[PDB]
Ligand binder design. Structure first.
Ligand SMILES: N=C(N)c1ccc2cccc(N)c2c1
Ligand code: NA
Length: 246
């Protein structure tokens, strides 16, 4: 997250921290995710497509820092790694950038909701917020594009939704951004999601209820003029989520 502010997991209790164990035992942060039900974390396929071994991953819930065991946190293994069959990546655009992680503790249990571990509601069909709506993003992603390390403390920011017509403008992304994708950015281009924030939530308050409107997918650089963050439009994939979580 470029700009924004430092936060803690109590303010984003659906946020999942996904790590990968490497050969030799080193563990590195991969992507963010969202708890949509006690057994299921939703993220982006591009986070896992090159290493699609469910055994390689570690999932934390209720974790506020990259290298601290936050009080009340829960650690999980991935029981099932479901990647969207029609995923593909162009130079910029990521297609069907959605994944499901069925989580299981070493005892074989799913998440136990607490004050710091909660689910995020899914959106309803054909009911996304209008352009200009302020939405929040959360992640352990880069604070600056030139950084090579990720911030130790969880960050959050607020961005505004951009219409598909505006995002398809030539100086924006042209025909590369599709109707299955949602753009969001800062009108002043100072705050944004960045590398490392992928898979993380774009949460919008709609009709008084907070919902998982988007999943951090792609963008040209970070917080660059006319280059919004691009998110998987979760409302399009509701038949796919429902069928793959049964
Ligand atoms: N500009 C963005 N919001 C954005 C979002 C996700 C990204 C993922 C990998 C690399 C980037 N530069 C990204 C930028
Ligand atoms: Na690390």
């Amino acid at each position: 997250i470029i700009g924004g502010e430092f936060t803690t997991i109590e303010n984003q209790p659906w946020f999942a921290a996904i790590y990968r164990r490497h050969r030799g035992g080193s563990v590195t942060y991969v992507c963010g995710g969202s708890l949509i039900s006690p057994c299921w974390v939703i993220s982006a396929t591009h986070c896992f497509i090159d290493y699609p071994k469910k055994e390689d991953y570690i999932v934390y819930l209720g974790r506020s820092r990259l290298n601290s065991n936050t009080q009340g946190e829960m650690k999980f293994e991935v029981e099932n790694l479901i990647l969207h069959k029609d995923y593909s990546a162009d130079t910029l655009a990521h297609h069907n950038d959605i994944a499901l992680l069925k989580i299981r503790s070493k005892e074989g249990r799913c998440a136990q909701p607490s004050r710091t571990i909660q689910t995020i509601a899914l959106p309803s069909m054909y009911n996304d917020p209008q352009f200009g709506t302020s939405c929040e993003i959360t992640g352990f992603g880069k604070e600056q594009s030139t950084d090579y390390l990720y911030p130790e403390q969880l960050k959050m920011t607020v961005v505004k939704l951009i219409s598909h017509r505006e995002c398809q403008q030539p100086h924006y992304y042209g025909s590369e951004v599709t109707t299955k994708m949602l753009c969001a950015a800062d009108p002043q281009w100072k705050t944004d999601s960045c590398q490392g924030d992928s898979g993380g939530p774009l949460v919008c308050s709609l009709q008084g209820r907070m919902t998982l409107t988007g999943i951090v997918s792609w963008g040209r650089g970070c917080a660059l003029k006319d280059k919004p963050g691009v998110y998987t439009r979760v409302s399009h994939f509701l038949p796919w989520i429902r069928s793959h979580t049964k």
